[PDB]
């Protein structure tokens, strides 16, 4: 319960579980760095409200709508792709850590 990787030992005086404090620390360091980098790469939104147009200004309204929709599409794609791609690397990282400890 006290870590991510560890040992189980059994000898004449008894048996029990223990956690490797050394490798868990590097794993935590890497994961924390990754999450902080992901948070930092995205900036906060400021005030952004809409505009108004009269009946003889339909082309400007359509251009405004096009710009808004395009930016929204691009940012949704970016966020989803980033999450999907990092999720696999995390699991590969954990597997490599366990294999390195065994070796």
């Amino acid at each position, epitope marked *: 319960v006290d870590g991510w990787y560890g040992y189980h030992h059994q000898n004449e005086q008894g048996s029990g579980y223990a956690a490797d404090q050394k490798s*868990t*620390q590097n794993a*935590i360091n890497g994961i*924390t760095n990754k999450v*902080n980098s992901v948070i930092e790469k995205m900036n906060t939104q400021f005030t952004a409200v809409g505009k108004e147009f009269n009946k003889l200004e339909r082309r400007m309204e359509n251009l405004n709508k096009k710009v808004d929709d395009g930016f929204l599409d691009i940012w949704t794609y970016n966020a989803e792709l980033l999450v999907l791609l990092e999720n696999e690397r995390t699991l590969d990282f954990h597997d490599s850590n366990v294999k390195n400890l065994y070796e």
Partner: nanobody, 118 residues
Framework: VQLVESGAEVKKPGSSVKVSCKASGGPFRSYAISWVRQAPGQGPEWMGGIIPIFGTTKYAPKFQGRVTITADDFAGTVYMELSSLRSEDTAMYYC??????????????WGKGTTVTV
């Protein structure tokens, strides 16, 4: 790394007080955070601590039952709530940080501290 506590409080017996500690840097930390207190003319007393990622919280037998430690990670804040205040709770409180993710006897960074009077 700098740790900043909240302001001073003046409370009445039987009430409850919540204090916060904010840590500089990235919102997510790779080290545990503990709370210590000291009464005037006395020595420090360890209250309890919290562990990153896992979220485990540990308390002291003297303070077990009356104190609650929580954390909010996306703002990098740690909260401590104490209830059933008495006259002996008047003391100065610090938030301290450890070198590792586990709660141990070695704390290397301390805060300025904040006073709670009853």
């Amino acid at each position: 790394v700098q740790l900043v506590e909240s302001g001073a409080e003046v409370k009445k017996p039987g009430s409850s007080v919540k204090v916060s500690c904010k840590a500089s840097g990235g919102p997510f930390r790779s080290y545990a955070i503990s709370w210590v207190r000291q009464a005037p003319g006395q020595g420090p007393e360890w209250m309890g601590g919290i562990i990153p990622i896992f979220g485990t919280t540990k308390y002291a037998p003297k303070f077990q039952g009356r104190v609650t430690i929580t954390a909010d990670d996306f703002a990098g804040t740690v909260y401590m709530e104490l209830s059933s205040l008495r006259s002996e709770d008047t003391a100065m409180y610090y938030c301290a940080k450890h070198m590792g993710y586990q709660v141990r006897e070695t704390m290397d960074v301390w805060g300025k501290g904040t006073t709670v009077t009853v």
